[PDB]
């Protein structure tokens, strides 16, 4: 594939477009505590819900700091819209830079996320305006392509992946309306079915440390290179995205490595992050604590023995579940991307209603497989496609 259009630097406007009357553009500075708080206030009450308005994402302030001030970040790519009078933040749209590989052409992109409009301003076509404005700011900085994901179908997705959910506290999930009771089953059977071992099995599993950064970087890059569409990690990005710094307020990222008991080389790693959802108007529960499978890698993949890879992943990911369960998560979420179809059904992940659609701006490439077939069920012959995860 390649770029759709070339942008003329000479022609990029130095001024933003008009906004709806009574509103103005505002660059957010998320190193200001009070500004990070305003973003959090906006997302907490207006960001992504399920269709039934039972749950809303509640990215924490630590999470917002981590996701939005990643290497190369610029405050210019954190775009707010404020009410002119009250100064209230009523919309946002954000970018951070990264590099991605699209069938072996590397591209400098922004990843767009945290598009949000206050409920009272919805269905006024402010979205195109937000998009066009962040687009202008990216073009002024020499960035002309983007990748983004959404839970909704929009023109020309590059891929689509299904959400899967492994219950950790099945009864809590039942009570909030997250997890159904299967037709002929009972709650006891579901509780029994979701039990997990009390201890991990992979020899040499331990938390990731800073000293592991270069090795993990090498291993993740080799492994991600197996996917048509992947994120091309830098060392700083591995540092930022994979290593928790206990000095955030509230841990966001959990990373574990496998140090081979004999060679002491790291041969595997996996990571998962913390994203809670507000439970809406339920007097007995206000929260679902989800862990999401993030990046991982294993040397076993380079053998191209799909059976040995499966085996290894069943072991590593069951350990990920045990760990998430010890860390008090209520559910573990994963998508059908990476080599995830190899283990999802076997580790008792249930199929979700949600889908994650992947999109590129200003770049054309052939559709990429998303780990599912025509029935939207996991498919080991439709992997090797999506090797990027967005937050
Ligand atoms: C070179 C750099 C380029 C950088 C830019 C790259 C592109 C980045 C793209 C942004 C990627 C963001 C990634 C994420 O953050 S995905 C998460 C998005 N956030 C939410 O779902 C939060 C809850 N919902 C809302 O806040 C509002 O409903 C939003 C803001 C989503 C739309 O507000 P509203 O409901 O009031 O609608 P409107 O009247 O203003 O506008 C209607 C138009 O907007 C199109 N639409 C609706 N939803 C989305 C969506 N999720 N991505 C892209 N476009 C979307 C829609 O098809 C229609 O298009 P069209 O009629 O023109 O065909
Ligand atoms: C528990 C829950 N909270 N929220 C807010 C939602 C939608 C749920 N249900 S769910 O099954 O976990 C689910 C469902 Cl139904 C649907 C989706 C698609 C959401 C896509 N978002 C997540 C990533 N972001 C970059 C784009 C917006 C994600 C999830 Cl995580």
What does this structure look like?
A hairpin with a 6-residue loop joins strand 11 (253-259) and strand 12. The protein folds into two domains: 1-144, 3-Layer(aba) Sandwich (Aminopeptidase); 145-391, Aminopeptidase (3-Layer(aba) Sandwich). The chain is built from eight helices and 17 strands. The protein has helices at residues 33-46, 61-68, 126-140, 170-175, 187-193, 213-224, 235-242, 306-326, and strands at 2-3, 23-27, 55-58, 78-83, 89-102, 105-117, 146-150, 159-167, 205-207, 229-231, 253-259, 266-279, 287-298, 331-335, 350-361, 363-364, 386-387. Residues 48-50, 55-57, 113, 149-151, 163, 277, 288, 333, 352-354, 356, 390-391 line the site of ligand XMQ. The PDB classes it as transferase.
């Amino acid at each position: 594939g390649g770029p759709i259009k070339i942008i003329d630097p000479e022609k990029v406007s130095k001024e933003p477009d008009a906004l709806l009357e009574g509103f103005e553009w505002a660059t957010l500075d998320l190193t200001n505590e009070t500004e990070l708080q305003e973003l959090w206030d906006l997302l907490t009450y207006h960001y992504v819900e399920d269709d039934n308005a039972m749950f809303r994402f509640r990215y924490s302030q630590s999470f917002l700091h981590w996701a939005l001030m990643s290497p190369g970040w610029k405050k210019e790519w954190h775009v707010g819209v404020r009410a002119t009078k009250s100064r209230k933040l009523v919309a946002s749209i954000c970018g951070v830079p990264t590099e991605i590989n699209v069938r072996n052409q590397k591209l400098k992109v922004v990843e767009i996320n945290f598009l949000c409009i206050h409920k009272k301003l919805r269905s006024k076509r402010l979205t195109p305006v937000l998009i066009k404005e962040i687009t202008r700011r990216c073009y002024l900085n020499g960035i002309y392509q983007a990748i983004y994901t959404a839970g909704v179908v929009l023109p020309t997705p590059v891929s689509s992946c299904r959400y899967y959910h492994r219950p950790l506290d099945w009864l809590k999930l039942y009570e909030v309306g997250f997890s159904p009771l299967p037709a002929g089953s009972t709650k006891a059977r579901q509780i029994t079915k979701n039990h997990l071992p009390s201890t991990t099995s992979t020899p040499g599993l331990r938390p990731m440390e800073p000293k592991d950064i270069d090795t993990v970087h090498d291993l993740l890059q080799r492994y991600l290179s197996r996917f048509a569409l992947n994120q091309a990690f830098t060392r700083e990005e591995v540092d930022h995205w994979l290593v928790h710094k206990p000095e955030v307020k509230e841990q966001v990222v959990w990373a574990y490595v496998v140090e081979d008991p004999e060679t002491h080389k790291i041969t595997d790693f996996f990571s998962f992050y913390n994203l809670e959802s507000t439970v809406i108007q339920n007097p007995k529960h206000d929260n679902v604590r989800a862990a999401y499978l993030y990046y991982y890698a294993t040397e076993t993949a380079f053998t191209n023995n799909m059976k040995a890879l499966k085996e290894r992943l069943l072991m590593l990911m069951n350990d990920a579940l045990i760990l998430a369960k010890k860390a008090h998560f209520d559910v573990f979420n994963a998508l059908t991307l990476h080599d995830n179809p190899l283990f999802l059904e076997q580790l008792k992940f249930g199929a979700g209603d949600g889908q994650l659609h992947f999109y590129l701006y200003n770049y054309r490439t052939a559709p990429v497989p998303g780990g599912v077939n025509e029935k939207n069920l996991p498919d080991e012959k439709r992997m090797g496609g999506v090797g990027i995860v967005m937050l």
